[PDB]
Design a protein around this ligand. Structure first.
Ligand SMILES: CCCCCCCCCCCCCCCCCCCC(=O)O[C@H](COC(=O)CCCCCCCCCCCCCC)COP(=O)(O)OCCN
Ligand SMILES: CCCCCCCCCCCCO[C@@H]1O[C@H](CO)[C@@H](O[C@H]2O[C@H](CO)[C@@H](O)[C@H](O)[C@H]2O)[C@H](O)[C@H]1O
Ligand SMILES: CCCCCCCCCCCCO[C@H]1O[C@H](CO)[C@@H](O[C@H]2O[C@H](CO)[C@@H](O)[C@H](O)[C@H]2O)[C@H](O)[C@H]1O
Ligand SMILES: CN(C)c1ccc(O)c2c1C[C@H]1C[C@H]3[C@H](N(C)C)C(O)=C(C(N)=O)C(=O)[C@@]3(O)C(O)=C1C2=O
Ligand SMILES: CCCCCCCCCC(=O)OC[C@H](CO)OC(=O)CCCCCCCCC
Ligand SMILES: CCCCCCCCCCCCCC
Ligand SMILES: CCCCCCCCCC[N+](C)(C)[O-]
Ligand SMILES: CCCCCCCCCCCC
Ligand SMILES: CCCCCCCCCC
Ligand SMILES: CCCCCCCCCC
Ligand SMILES: CCCCCCCC
Ligand SMILES: CCCCCC
Ligand SMILES: [Cl-]
Ligand code: NA
Lengths: 1034, 156, 48, 48
């Protein structure tokens, strides 16, 4: 095939051109995102029950929905939260590869048939079924600076004039409002209600009567009286539109004839649907939009389009309103692209310099300069074909393959330049013979590297989907590199390279290039003498090899494991946790202190603090909040002291002073769904109807025991909330019936006043919005206020709540958890320093088998996937090793010689482990894929040494030592050229301290160190391996 | 409310005997109360931690401390069936006829949850069997309404 | 094209003063002028 | 697939006859099927 294309250089160019256009087209049309979809498909069912406690929500909503989630395909597990904010979230997680649309529609179809079983108030609110995801493209803040608008006012403006337009913007997949559109808030006064012998029941009845759509009919409607000339619609009562109209709603006509209006017994204003969250941006009221990227969309185009649409809205903004961008991924993703293109261009430049340094003609330097781009473009065309995106994983996958692509180019050209210098053949005849020597090996290498990388694509779960991104990227780039090496490069060599007279090694030249050729020819004789000496005493090198193998194994176990490096993304999070039962105002005072620290102590670094009061990740009661800190641009934060990690640690140490409030700052993870390094996710399950209290005792018993093994387990805590004081009120049924007071009137009055009640909808400036009745704050704060609410009896007398009720303090759950339909409590933790997650999980299981009767357990999230991903590893390692052996066996026509190649693996791995360990890095994904490519290139170097050596023995009948010495002599220049170019090529990634430097450092460090040892050791050890293996087997 | 007061409330609740011991030695406020007016003794009585009830009373805890709705530790212990704690509280001078804001007594609560052993102890320490709540209900009225045959026979 | 509409306006206060419920008015107007689907019957074995 | 040499027949009321008339029609068809033992066997209704 190389012979075919040496005589047909135009056909070769045509193939290169088709590949280039396909790739050029792919580069324009390929999606762009920071990260691809990794986590398995999850569907969330969300429902609201205004004024409902955790148990009410669980026993009227959660249990009914859970009992109806049957006959749905590919469900792995199901988990739910029911909490005292009147909220339920059920999450159904599906097998990796499940169609998310079919999963969602199957879930919401089974929900639809369960809807008639839910309370009327829940059916009225509705039950959302959504595709679950946590990766926002950006967060657009909307603030008011002139103090004329509350967060409720901004939320309504954004909902009415911004949200829909952003949802319609090109590439926008989803938009979450940080707030609600206005609600008509009827704030009831029980003093005024009792004055006119009225209750919340009468308020609700009147609103439903006097705020409603009423169907009428038509004038001259069909069937008509023949001769009818006019046909027109009759418009009757339509919904109210203003606070004024709601104010004038008639409640009572008194004996004397005066009117009791709704404004006489209530304050009436446009407010929020909920008052749980208080959002501030640098102390100013704030709403905002959480924007997610649509499937297959370009992140950079979408972000531009969003900013373009926001620009068009600028002129209509009320005075004081302003757009802010506290979170935007696209600046970071744009730097990733720039830095990768920069690395690939520098790589090509370094190959040009190294090619000229050794071969010293511009015609030679042009051949890799053509071949490498053709492969890189071709790789994009194949990625597009597999439906992959340009993302962090696929981009760094190409960087990790640079060494393999550069080598294919250098190997083919250098070997032609040598054959011409040693034999005197003209370029065309030299290229034919040169390809004749390597073409069989190039195909062998392709199969070996396929055997190495292809099995990496068949890991299951989240980590599998990450490894799959690198696997296809690297195999594709490698596969095209070999096709270009057998088609284009030979044709280019045959037609572009000038002849070299037999014996001309450029020693006769003058200047630097004359000196260099003399030095390098002299250095090649020093090398062949050294191998000569090494091969006379092979015994002590087999000893040095086992010292390396043991040193490797030792360094492997000591190297801490992780997933993806933390990055400076110009943002981080501060958690604010007060003691249980702490009020919104107490949490606000702590957030004001946290915000004040960042705008004082970090005025150089911090751009904004987004303070969300009454929001948490494991429930959002009044005692929880978060401060989202956005930093100034990377340029204006020089040095390690002004980066996220340093600011995080300083903030955490300052806030540990704060009394009766757990406050700490932390960097965001690369991908949220992966979790912490060697963390676990444990579920304790009530399997025999024990109940909340007995499951709590069992949880505490497990926690107490886990604390006694700090050598194995660290930070083993519950994810949920502790039981809190709650106000049990008992309605005396006999007293109610005796006074002629209905239970409906009692339960409505209590619920409406203290909990709130969604009555019906009104239309505010052409937009349908909700009407809520609730007590004004001051009449629903303390137990004494219960007595101030009156209910009208059948006989018309007003009866206070005190007359027919009794109350007491008890403890109950503000958040009840369920796993696969049964009561549960989620326990988080991680393996101790030096211990594996497997060991930590094994102990937790052992401890769990000692808990009371009817208490079971299960693993979820990352722990579920680790158990199913860990069991695949042995099989995939084994298949890789077996197919590599079989491919080399076929190449060399020998069961033994393969071992001489395969023995190279540790020579690269030892340098990677030394460099990672020394620089204080982890055994992360980037490092691991780095080992495979380092192993891959060292294997390639070894394969060609052994092929050359074996050919000289088979064809020219030379001796083992003679063949081995002639082989390593010929392979020295190309091996050093590739290594010099590639090591220099990754040097910028190692020293990088900018944005995305975490990833660059992880890719660079392990590869640099691995290549240094792989290069230096292999040139001495590969000849030893071949001699020992040939001796031992005939 | 002090630092150690809050620590004692949490420890008394959790049943961490060894931590309560250390807190008693450092003089953690035994009369410390949360926002609903619950003392460490209230919490220990509720969750049924006998050892801590005894240790708190040794360290001058108010046996007749009442929450913001007039409920005592004896109310809690009687209601949740903690027989041993009821005996200890009564031996350390707990008001057996203590009335909350609803006029409810330990006898009322014990009768309601059918704790026969506790009813006998309360009557032994001179619980007023004729005591009426805000609805004019006795422990006997509760026994017949609940249909508790054994209990109704004892409250003769 | 834009159509003429006959807007009828029920005075609920004047109706309450005469002792007539709004529900009875709404149903009477709706049933008479627009018609009202009450329930199903069986016409030769078919629900209608 | 089926029951080897078995058929699965559906008698239909096409004109709103009713259950009573359709039962007679079924009985008439069952009676005539019994009068041809040489062709049809175990010809019976699946219902109640
Ligand atoms: C995967 C399982 C699924 C099933 C797939 C089934 C198919 C398996 C693949 C089939 C490959 C067989 C190759 C058949 C070639 C027959 C040609 C015989 C003549 C010959 O000497 O071969 C020359 C080429 O070989 C050479 O000169 C090559 C150099 C010597 C061998 C090089 C070894 C190649 C690298 C091996 C990599 C390992 C692969 C592992 C699978 C062509 O001569 P000609 O006939 O044109 O001349 C004109 C003569 N009148
Ligand atoms: C921190 C990095 C450490 C990496 C590990 C080191 C391995 C890579 C360096 C290999 C250097 C090879 O250096 C080579 O060693 C052999 C020793 O067998 C010497 O060989 C010497 O001893 C042998 C055995 O008695 C004699 O046959 C030979 O005549 C004599 O010269 C070579 O003259 C020397 O050039
Ligand atoms: C608008 C952007 C949204 C980003 C969502 C962020 C998701 C975080 C939710 C969980 C937060 C609760 O806090 C909990 O999770 C954090 C994950 O970041 C943990 O943080 C952990 O992982 C981080 C990875 O970047 C590391 O930098 C920390 O050293 C490590 O401790 C905290 O130790 C833990 O207390
Ligand atoms: C958690 N999240 C990102 C934020 C951040 C800042 C905010 O200022 C807010 C949220 C959540 C949203 C949720 C929305 C929700 N919805 C979309 C209307 C909602 O139903 C509730 C609720 N308590 O049910 C809100 O509080 C809410 O109105 C709200 O006030 C929010 C809000 O103000
Ligand atoms: C030339 C022979 C190479 C054989 C090694 C190939 C093993 C790869 C198996 C596989 O597909 O898993 C990929 C894996 C996913 O995390 O990536 C890795 O973690 C890298 C594994 C390196 C192991 C070094 C071996 C040293 C002892 C011999
Ligand atoms: C060319 C390489 C093919 C790789 C195929 C891997 C499939 C193995 C399945 C792993 C699961 C086995 C569990 C015991
Ligand atoms: C972008 C495509 C450039 C193609 C130019 C290649 C010219 C090859 C001609 C070689 N020749 C036949 C003269 O030897
Ligand atoms: C899993 C199968 C591995 C293949 C090993 C074959 C080795 C054959 C040795 C023959 C020696 C003469
Ligand atoms: C899960 C599918 C994995 C297939 C990998 C094959 C890659 C070949 C690229 C040319
Ligand atoms: C005495 C040790 C000699 C080793 C010299 C090796 C030369 C390698 C040049 C690339
Ligand atoms: C429109 C954005 C194109 C970015 C191309 C990136 C190539 C690696
Ligand atoms: C003779 C070269 C073989 C190449 C097949 C991929
Ligand atoms: Cl030149
Ligand atoms: Na009711």
């Amino acid at each position: 095939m190389p012979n075919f294309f040496i005589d047909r250089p135009i056909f070769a160019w045509v193939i290169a051109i088709i590949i280039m256009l396909a790739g050029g087209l792919a580069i324009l049309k390929l999606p762009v995102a920071q990260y691809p979809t990794i986590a398995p498909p999850a569907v969330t069912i969300s429902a609201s029950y205004p004024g409902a406690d955790a148990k009410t929500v669980q026993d009227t909503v959660t249990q009914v929905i859970e009992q109806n989630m049957n006959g749905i395909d590919n469900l792995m597990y199901m988990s739910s939260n029911s909490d005292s904010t009147g909220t339920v979230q059920i999450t159904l997680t599906f097998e990796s590869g499940t169609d998310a649309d079919i999963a969602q529609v199957q879930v919401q179809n089974k929900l639809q048939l369960a809807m008639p079983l839910l309370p009327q108030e829940v059916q009225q609110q509705g039950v959302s079924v959504e595709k679950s995801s946590s990766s926002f493209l950006m967060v657009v803040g909307v603030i008011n600076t002139d103090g004329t608008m509350t967060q409720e006012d901004i939320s309504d403006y954004v909902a009415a004039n911004m949200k829909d337009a952003i949802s319609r913007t090109s590439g926008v997949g989803d938009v979450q409002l940080f707030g609600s559109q206005y609600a008509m808030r009827i704030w009831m006064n029980p003093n005024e209600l009792n004055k006119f012998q009225l209750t919340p029941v009468d308020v609700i009845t009147a609103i439903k009567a006097q705020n409603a759509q009423v169907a009428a009919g038509q004038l001259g409607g069909t069937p008509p009286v023949k001769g009818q000339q006019l046909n027109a619609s009759i418009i009757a009562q339509t919904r109210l539109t203003s606070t004024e109209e709601f104010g004038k709603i008639l409640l009572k006509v008194n004996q004397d004839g005066s009117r009791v209006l709704l404004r006489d017994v209530a304050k009436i204003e446009l407010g929020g649907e909920n008052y749980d969250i208080i959002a501030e941006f640098n102390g100013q009221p704030a709403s905002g939009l959480g924007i997610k990227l649509a499937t297959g969309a370009n992140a950079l185009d979408t972000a531009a389009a969003i900013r373009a649409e926001l620009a068009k809205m600028e002129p209509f903004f009320p005075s004081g309103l302003k757009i802010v961008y506290p979170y935007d991924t696209t600046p970071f993703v744009k730097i990733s692209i720039h830095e990768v293109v920069k690395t690939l261009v520098e790589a090509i430049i370094l190959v040009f310099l190294v090619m000229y340094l050794f071969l010293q003609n511009f015609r030679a330097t042009l051949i890799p300069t053509i071949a490498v781009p053709v492969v890189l473009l071709g790789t994009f065309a194949v990625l597009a074909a597999f439906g992959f995106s340009i993302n962090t994983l696929t981009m760094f996958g190409m960087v990790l393959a640079i060494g393999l692509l550069v080598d294919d180019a250098i190997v083919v050209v250098e070997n032609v330049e040598r054959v011409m210098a040693e034999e005197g053949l003209p370029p065309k005849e030299a290229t034919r013979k040169s390809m004749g020597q390597i073409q069989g090996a190039l195909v062998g290498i392709a199969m070996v590297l396929s055997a190495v990388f292809v099995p990496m694509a068949f890991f299951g779960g989240s980590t599998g989907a990450i490894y799959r991104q690198f696997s296809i990227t690297i195999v594709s780039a490698m596969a095209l590199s070999v096709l270009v090496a057998l088609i284009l490069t030979p044709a280019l060599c045959a037609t572009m390279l000038k002849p070299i007279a037999k014996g001309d090694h450029g020693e006769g030249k003058k200047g630097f290039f004359g000196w260099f050729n003399r030095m390098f020819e002299k250095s090649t004789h020093h090398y062949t003498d050294s191998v000569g000496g090494i091969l006379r005493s092979t015994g002590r090198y087999l000893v040095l090899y086992l010292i390396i193998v043991v040193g490797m194994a030792y360094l492997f176990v000591r190297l801490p494991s992780s997933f993806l490096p933390d990055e400076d993304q110009g943002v981080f999070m501060t958690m604010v946790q007060l003691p249980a039962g702490a009020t919104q105002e107490r949490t606000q005072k702590v957030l004001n202190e946290v915000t004040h620290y960042y705008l004082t102590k970090e005025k150089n670094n911090v751009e904004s603090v987004f303070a969300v009061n009454g929001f948490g990740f494991a429930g959002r009661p009044q005692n929880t909040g978060i401060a989202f800190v956005s930093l100034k641009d990377w340029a204006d934060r020089p040095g390690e002291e002004n980066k996220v990690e340093a600011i995080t640690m300083r903030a955490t140490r300052a806030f540990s002073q704060i009394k009766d409030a757990m406050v700490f700052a932390f960097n965001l993870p690369a991908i949220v769904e992966l979790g912490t390094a060697t963390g676990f996710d444990f579920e304790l399950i009530d399997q025999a109807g024990l109940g909340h209290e007995k499951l709590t005792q069992a949880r505490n018993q497990l926690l107490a025991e886990a604390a006694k093994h700090p050598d194995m387990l660290t930070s083993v805590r519950p994810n949920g909330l502790e039981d809190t004081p709650q106000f049990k009120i008992d309605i005396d049924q006999e007293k109610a019936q005796a006074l002629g007071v209905s239970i409906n009137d009692i339960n409505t009055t209590l619920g409406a006043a203290w909990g709130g009640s969604y009555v019906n909808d009104f239309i505010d400036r052409g937009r349908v919005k909700k009407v809520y009745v609730m007590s004004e704050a001051k009449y629903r704060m303390l137990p004494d206020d219960i007595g101030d609410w009156y209910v009208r009896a059948a006989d018309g007398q007003m009866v206070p709540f005190s007359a027919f009720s009794s109350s007491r303090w008890e403890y109950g759950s503000p958040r009840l958890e369920r796993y696969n339909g049964l009561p549960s409590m989620e326990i988080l933790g991680q393996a101790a320093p030096g211990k594996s997650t497997g060991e930590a999980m094994e102990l937790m299981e052992q401890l769990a088998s000692k808990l009371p009767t009817g208490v079971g357990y299960d693993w979820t999230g990352m722990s579920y996937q680790e158990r199913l991903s860990g069991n695949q590893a042995p099989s995939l390692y084994a298949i890789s090793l077996i197919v590599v052996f079989l491919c080399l066996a076929a190449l060399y026509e020998s069961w033994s010689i393969p071992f001489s190649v395969m023995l190279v693996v540790p020579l690269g791995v030892i340098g990677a482990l030394l460099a990672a360990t020394f620089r204080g890095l982890t055994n992360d994904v980037y490092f691991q894929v780095g080992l495979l490519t380092t192993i891959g290139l060292s294997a390639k170097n070894a394969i060609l040494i052994v092929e050359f050596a074996k050919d000289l023995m088979d064809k020219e009948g030379k001796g083992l030592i003679e063949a081995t010495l002639d082989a390593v002599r010929m392979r020295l220049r190309p091996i050093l050229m590739t290594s010099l170019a590639f090591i220099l090529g990754v040097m910028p990634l190692v020293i990088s301290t900018g944005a995305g430097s975490g990833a660059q450092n992880a890719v660079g460090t392990g590869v640099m160190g691995g290549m240094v040892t792989a290069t230096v050791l292999a040139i001495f050890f590969v000849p030893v391996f071949f001699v020992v293996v040939r001796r031992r087997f005939s | 409310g002090s630092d150690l007061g809050k620590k004692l409330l949490e420890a008394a609740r959790a049943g961490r005997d060894d931590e309560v011991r250390i807190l008693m030695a450092n003089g953690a406020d035994v009369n410390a109360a949360d926002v609903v007016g619950w003392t460490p003794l209230h919490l220990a009585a509720y969750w049924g931690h006998l050892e801590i009830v005894e240790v708190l009373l040794k360290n001058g805890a108010d046996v007749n401390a009442y929450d913001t709705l007039g409920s005592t530790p004896l109310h809690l212990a009687a209601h949740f069936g903690h027989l041993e704690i009821v005996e200890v509280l009564l031996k350390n001078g707990a008001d057996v006829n203590a009335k909350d804001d609803n006029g409810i007594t330990p006898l009322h609560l014990a009768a309601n949850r059918g704790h026969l052993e506790i009813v006998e102890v309360l009557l032994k320490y001179g619980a007023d069997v004729n005591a009426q709540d805000k609805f004019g209900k006795t422990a006997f009225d509760i026994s017949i309404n609940n249909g508790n045959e054994d209990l109704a026979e004892i409250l003769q």
